[PDB]
Design a protein around this ligand. Sequence first.
Ligand SMILES: *C(=O)c1ncc(Br)cc1OCc1ccc2ccccc2c1
Ligand SMILES: *C(=O)c1ncc(Br)cc1OCc1ccc2ccccc2c1
Lengths: 290, 292
Amino acid sequence: SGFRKMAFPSGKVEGCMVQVTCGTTTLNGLWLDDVVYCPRHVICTSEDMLNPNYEDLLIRKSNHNFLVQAGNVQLRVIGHSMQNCVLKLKVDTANPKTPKYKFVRIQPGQTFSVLACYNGSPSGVYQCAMRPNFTIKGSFLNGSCGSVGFNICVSFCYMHHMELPGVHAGTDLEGNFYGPFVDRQTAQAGTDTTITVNVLAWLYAAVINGDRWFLLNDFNLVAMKYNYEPLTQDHVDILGPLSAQTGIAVLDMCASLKELLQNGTILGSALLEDEFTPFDVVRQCSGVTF
Amino acid sequence: SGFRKMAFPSGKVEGCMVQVTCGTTTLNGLWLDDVVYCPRHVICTDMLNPNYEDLLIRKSNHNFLVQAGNVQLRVIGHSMQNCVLKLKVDTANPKTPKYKFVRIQPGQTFSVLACYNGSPSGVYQCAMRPNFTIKGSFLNGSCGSVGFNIDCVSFCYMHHMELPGVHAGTDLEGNFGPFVDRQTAQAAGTDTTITVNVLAWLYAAVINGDRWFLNTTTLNDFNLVAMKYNYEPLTQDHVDILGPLSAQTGIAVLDMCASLKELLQNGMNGRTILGSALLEDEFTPFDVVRQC
Ligand SMILES: *C(=O)c1ncc(Br)cc1OCc1ccc2ccccc2c1
Ligand SMILES: *C(=O)c1ncc(Br)cc1OCc1ccc2ccccc2c1
């Protein structure tokens, strides 16, 4: 019983957090095998950010211009390359704490844990959603760049690159930004919408936990007026297991959310929560371990 | 910027989680040095009204199976301290962090590593309610999961029971609120809001640009309003702990108290504060300074 915003256990990722330094600029890096991944803007001076030509800036930098420290020890860099917006620094030492891992590019609406890090050291962990406009609503201070988001074998899906004038943007671990954003300090995020299939998953969580007072082409007409993402049959199939668990059909739950949108606590929140996936609900409500 | 409910990184606690089985009952234990800690109800079949001493008598060391991953630890001693079982094993946990056992005060927050069969499931941040319950996420099998703060790991909580939807447990010496480890109906006090935490969170909001609620008063005047709305009384100690936030924001603590009184008397009008449509009280002033 109970429902909470739950993050994955962060131990396997803490053992991969190193501190990358280049000139004055120091940020966080991800040490897996004999390679360290970090935002390529580590090579940028303060004046460089306004309009960096990365290839030119990187060419002016050599292997020894990169200080990689794992806790107390300093690793030796024997190679460097740029993959899209991430820097790959080959080191002479495989990380002995490298977990089984994969790199994954998630889709809008999916969630993950962020281990927020400063100077290579963990600060805290929290759960996040990739918004439909490909930002995330996190808690990121200057210095947190390079922290990663992940699901758990660890599937890394996000590296933090920038704080916008109060949401945040970043890349997958191949360095491609999520969204239209570029790693340059110029003003840059379109209309965000609410993740409908996620709100429906959370209403099922509510019913599972005893909170039931609120109990398709038609539904999308309503949701569109309220800046809710349209609900597709793929989304209905995803909610199938929750429906079979609760004995409440999917279109029945949508009918419930319609009235909620027009008329205005559920699981102790006064707003409709859209940062729980259907997999999140099943995971938390059936106690999946790792 | 931004402001999330944030847990502590959990790797040090992950390394201490094991599985403890006694007869049929399996739950989680906490393995530090050569001792495994778990709820004493691991020995109950019973449980409507268990005589714990008499149930313990019927148990020997080999009736306790303790697994740490795939490794089976050998139990060479066992004792009951208050409501927790302490199992002496033949191996000290190599991954033992620097640690303390602490009893936190109502209103302090901690991180809970939820666990099943000795394996981590997830981490989330919690507050000890003024009525000494916690509003957690615990299924059957989660008993023995622990709550902790980090500076050195300070263990403050071990989970024992779900009341007929909130949660109750003990410190790591096994002292529970008024609750006992028996399946009888049990009443928590009326719960109240943690005023000093609400204020800390309003400061957090101002640091992050949410100012719309800024509108003075006296400690005694505010307290009269706090009582009517089931808010914990505010003390000069509380005002003192908010000092650093006041200096950062340049908003006097009693000025923030008046804005909150206004929020308490007028409601929120459908507006939000840090993405919440209610007043959040599970952040301490320390939590706010740490995050910010
Ligand atoms: C971000 O995590 C970070 N930490 C430490 C430092 Br010294 C710099 C950091 O990023 C600042 C940054 C870099 C690039 C940008 C492009 C566009 C807008 C804002 C930024 C900010
Ligand atoms: C608790 O999470 C738990 N996990 C696994 C098992 Br096999 C049993 C568990 O609790 C049973 C229990 C213990 C103490 C109680 C006290 C008061 C009411 C109910 C219980 C239930």
